[PDB]
Structure formats: C-alpha cells, structure tokens
Design an enzyme around this catalytic site. Structure first.
Site: not given
Ligand SMILES: C[S@@+](CC[C@H](N)C(=O)[O-])C[C@H]1O[C@@H](n2cnc3c(N)ncnc32)[C@H](O)[C@@H]1O
Ligand SMILES: O=C(c1ccccc1)c1ccc(O)c(O)c1[N+](=O)[O-]
Ligand SMILES: [Mg+2]
Length: 214
Positions: A140, A143, A168-169, A198
């Site tokens: 996280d 990226k 994540d993401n 989020e």
C-alpha cells in the site's frame, strides 16, 4: 505547521478510547468520512483485510506504507499472541504519527516501524532484522513500487510457498504492471476482491496473490 496527519492523530487522541484498537479505527474513519479525506485503506477494504488476517493467521507480516497507522492498527489487533508486524515508512513525519497511533491503541509491542524506503530496507531484513521468510505482505505504498518490491522480495528469499501478498488500489488509482505480473505468473494463485475506495463509493479492489514458489 499543522498537517492532515496531525489532525487525524489529534482527533483520535481527543475521541477514541486509549488501548482500544477498534475505537481508534472508528475514530479515524469518522474523522475521514465527515471532515477530511485520507489515504487509509478504510473500513470497506479493511474488512477484507481482516478476513485475510483471520484466514491465514500470519506470524510475521510486512506492510509497505504505514502512513498514520490505520492499516497497522487493523492488522495488529487481529494478530495471534507472539505474532509481529513490520511496517516500512519512508516519511519520518508519518512514521512518528504511526508510532503515536500504535501507542494510543496499545499495539506498540506487536509492531516495529522501519524508517526508510522499502527498496533499501527489504534487502536488509535477513541481516539486520533477523527475518527468515514472511507469512504475509500488505502492499500500500506508491503504486510504481509494487512490482519492483515484489520482484525484490522474491530475489531476496523472503517469500515462501503460501506467503500471502495483499495489494491495495489495484483498480483505483490502479497497479497495472503489478497485476499483469502476478496474473501472468504461475508463481501466484490470485483472488480479486472488489470493494470501494476509502471513504467513497468509487469501486476499488484488493488483489490476494499467494506465492507458490519459483
Ligand atoms: C496509502 S499510504 C499507506 C496507508 C496505510 N497502509 C493505511 O491503510 O493506513 C502510502 C504510504 O507509503 C509511503 N511510501 C511510499 N513509498 C514508499 C517506499 N518506497 N517505502 C516506504 N514507504 C513508502 C508513503 O510515505 C505513505 O505514507
Ligand atoms: O495515489 C493515491 C492518491 C492519488 C491522488 C490523490 C490522493 C491519493 C492513493 C489513493 C488511495 C490509496 O488507497 C493509496 O494508497 C494511494 N497512494 O497514494 O498510495
Ligand atoms: Mg491504498
């Protein structure tokens, strides 16, 4: 000068119950929903993270990107006795906030914060931090680092068969190079978990990629 991260921490210190991790999470989520967005994994994705921790009961978890300690609080509150989280954070201001957050939640003895960039720290884990292999990694951080850190983790011998990567993401902002790698590789058995970014209803997701060996 005052910052977002200080405001989050002060809100927690003002409103959450000392030594109660769930109250700390709820305070962060309330503040970030009502007053000010922040890049915490958040409750919707956080419940998927919780389910992964419970399923795999990892003894040693590595987090890449601590920020204010939200995800560290989430994971560390579900770790078994004697289990440990290492979390890498390159920004010393954020590392400081994370330490205070953990202290407030009463989880400081289950977590070690490593100050530095993951690309520098990952190759030192075996020598300096006495690590053999990791049971789980939560990615996280920025990226563009997911793919090179994954390759580096493998190269350094830190992954074993069954090590769980949780990223994540992967939808928003997106991690296209990392997804193409794990989804193109017979070394990873992957599951996608669709959820929400989020504090909003924009769709995002987490990728669970379980290392199978070389
Ligand atoms: C999205 S925030 C982490 C949020 C946190 N995981 C949570 O859910 O509460 C990303 C963090 O990664 C840190 N970061 C970015 N690149 C890094 C790197 N190469 N090594 C260590 N930390 C990094 C940033 O300073 C930032 O605090
Ligand atoms: O990249 C951002 C970003 C981009 C633009 C503006 C604000 C944040 C972000 C958004 C949601 C995340 O869950 C996350 O981890 C990140 N990140 O910075 O690592
Ligand atoms: Mg994120």
């Amino acid at each position: 000068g005052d910052t977002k991260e200080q405001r989050i921490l002060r809100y927690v210190q003002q409103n959450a119950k000392p030594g109660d991790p769930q109250s700390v999470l709820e305070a962060i989520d309330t503040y970030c929903t009502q007053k000010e967005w922040a890049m915490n994994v958040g409750d919707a994705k956080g419940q998927i993270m919780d389910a992964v921790i419970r399923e795999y009961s990892p003894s040693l978890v590595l987090e890449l990107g601590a920020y204010c300690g939200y995800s560290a609080v989430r994971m560390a509150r579900l770790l078994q006795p004697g289990a440990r989280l290492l979390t890498m954070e390159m920004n010393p201001d954020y590392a400081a906030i994370t330490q205070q957050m953990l202290n407030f939640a009463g989880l400081q003895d289950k977590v070690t914060i490593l100050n530095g960039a993951s690309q520098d720290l990952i190759p030192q884990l075996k020598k300096k931090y006495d690590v053999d292999t990791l049971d789980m990694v939560f990615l996280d951080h920025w990226k563009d680092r997911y793919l090179p850190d994954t390759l580096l983790l493998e190269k350094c011998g830190l992954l074993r068969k069954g090590t769980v990567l949780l990223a994540d993401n992967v939808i928003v902002p997106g991690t296209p190079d990392f997804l193409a790698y794990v989804r193109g590789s017979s070394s990873f058995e992957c599951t996608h978990y669709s959820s929400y970014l989020e504090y909003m209803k924009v769709v995002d997701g987490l990728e669970k990629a379980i290392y199978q060996g070389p």
